[PDB]
Amino acid sequence: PQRVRDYQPAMLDELLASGEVMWSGAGQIGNGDGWVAFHLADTAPLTLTHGAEIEFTDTHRVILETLGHGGAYFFRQLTDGTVEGTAGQELKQALWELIWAGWVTGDTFAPVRAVLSGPRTDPTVSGRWSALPAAEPDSTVRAHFQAELLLGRHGVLTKGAVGAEGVPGGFATLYKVLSAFEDAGRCQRGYFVESLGGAQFAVASTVDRLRSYLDNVDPERPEYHAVVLAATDPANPYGAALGWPTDSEAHRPGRKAGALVALVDGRLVWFLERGGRSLLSFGADADAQRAAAGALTDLVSAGRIPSLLVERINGVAVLDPDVDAERAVVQDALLGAGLSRTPRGLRL
């Protein structure tokens, strides 16, 4: 909903059913949270990964061997004469374990919208469940497509982003294949971003676009554009290419699920951790926190994120008389943006 100015969830299921995209989740988190990976249907076998390995009990084999030589099925037609009473709960728990490993795929995004809704016909398993096309075996073609895709996703492909991204053979194999590109000419092969200090292949056209945004040599007041981002969506250079600012010698943030990095004017001022309850101001500067706070407030008020009423910092969490300067600016910022103060120390 951030990069598609108007997004009503019924806009997504319109694609999934049409047959142009494939969801194929491929990683499980806790309970009721996963790693989904939207592929395109034209070239699905390329961007897909090999199926994970699991225990493979017998009921799993029952779910397969029927989806295998067939197109797709409903939940009920997976097996015969089993009701939701006793065999259902074992069949379902066998299913949602088979999908997070990545062997079956819903024909729409309706179930996962529910498995997040928390335990409260059943909505958890509704649409048609299809066996998933086997990922293309690693070859030269897979390599070229992955390299071109990465170049399309990131602006300037670095040694960093290939690290956070999961590609076989490490950055060493890409540099071998991208050199073949640079020879043919589809890539610039210029030192574009300085601190990366490597070989950023990028593309001929992107550099012309990248050369803008270059800070003007004369002094000027900053623009203060605040853009809040989920800590693990590819439009987040930190943790992948730029690396984190080295602060809080022991306590370190990362690309954890559910965390928020709120970077304004490129530099990251804050970091939320696990939905509130931790704020990680990194070398704050006054009136920049104002912009990030405005960002967070418009976000919570638009409803994209569950409200944050729980706040702490590194160790100075709430009303410490030992109050520091760096903890002060955070407070003066959050109160000014209108965020509530001292509703309670805890929450059940």
Place this chain on the structure above:
Amino acid sequence: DPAVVASTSAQLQHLTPERAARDAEGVADLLRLLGPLTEADIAQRCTADNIGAWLDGLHAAKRALPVTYAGQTWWAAVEDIGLLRDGIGVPVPVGVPAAFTESASDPLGDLIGRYARTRGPFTTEQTAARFGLGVRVASDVLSRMAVDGRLIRGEFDAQVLKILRRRSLAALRAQVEPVSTDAYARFLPSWQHVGSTNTTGVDGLATVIEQLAGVPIPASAVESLVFPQRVRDYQPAMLDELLASGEVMWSGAGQIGNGDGWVAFHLADTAPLTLTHGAEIEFTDTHRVILETLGHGGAYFFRQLTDGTVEGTAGQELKQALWELIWAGWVTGDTFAPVRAVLSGPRTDPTVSGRWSALPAAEPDSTVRAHFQAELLLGRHGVLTKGAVGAEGVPGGFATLYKVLSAFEDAGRCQRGYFVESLGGAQFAVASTVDRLRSYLDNVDPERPEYHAVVLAATDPANPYGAALGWPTDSEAHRPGRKAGALVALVDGRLVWFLERGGRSLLSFGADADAQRAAAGALTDLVSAGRIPSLLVERINGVAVLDPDVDAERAVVQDALLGAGLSRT
């Protein structure tokens, strides 16, 4: 009082021309409600002549089963046969998943209780005679459950006792039976369009404001709790369309704090009547200035009031000098953007945006004002009562109002009957609505409640409590009232909860079983739609237990907050 006993017992027993099973499935309900019955007894309850076919078809469909426990054969519903099996009766051999449980708390006693729930006066030996094991067992259960109030020694049926006591009352006086208090509190909301889907659009809101003319509502409650519930699809532009069109005209009356205030919408056709008088505060010079230029004028923007400078403390002192006049009730904005801003608090300049018009002169107190007020009051409440006149401001008190209402009754525009049970005894209303009031009447059946929760702001006129009914108990320190920003949640006529503010205490007041689930659900629906200005919080909940440990009274309250979700606890 013997005569009315036969009639009610007839109605209880589903043994009248009305209330007679007229279909095949219709009897099964009658059978599970009245308990097992002999077929010949079913025949006189049904409207058909041949009842054997219905029963045997039901049995083949396994909806009701034959029974032969006593000499006479009877027909119990399959839901009771699994329980009746604990008695002398024998269950069916064929597998029936309805008989998953065989023994209840006490099966042989409970069937006696349901038996008495339908009958009136009865004798102990008669209970066992129709269906009973031993006479000693009969006198046991009677002295049993005496603490539970079941089977009180009414004449020889505790819930029936109250019904007959009521109905036997108002037999000497030629009056129909009064309506229950809970029924009235179920009636007053829908009598003002709350939850109704008829009312919508601009016409709907011009209908609502009609009957809510005189009352003052907190500015934060308006258009968040009181209007968006009546008008099914409320958009804050609509109320701006009325106000600008010259059709209604808000006029504040007293402020509660820095932000919120009382704002009381008048209809424009008859404003001079439902207008109160000025607040009679002390007047400095700048106030005389504002009231001068607005004196002979129709409206003026903020700037034109004090030609000169309006910026800085020279003019900013005039802003605060004006927003003092408005809350007093002398000037009103030609729209509802200012008051929409005042409640928003600080971060041109809003809060003086629209035109500011002097207010039409309040009608000098007279008979025609008394007449109009006595007319209007009957529109807001179903049945005017000596109570409601109290909580509402009336410049003559109930004493002088009651007099002109007598002229109304003698003219024939209102019936002086005794309509609601608990209340004073000289309440009355218009004739047409009494019919509507006669619905919602609790039928004399052991029926399970509907659990249709509803949530109102405490100052909302739809809240009967404190107006006519009166607060049910102040047995301890914490007292509830009609303070601003307080919510009153009520599943049926009786209220279960109360909130003092979005984060303040909560009153478990009723402590009823399983009703708190629906009430918490309704609170959740409001919070989700965004109606409540905040998300709900409760720290001082209960008696101010604060939930450090579990108490016996609160037991279900927490588990209910888990039921809705306790988005904050």
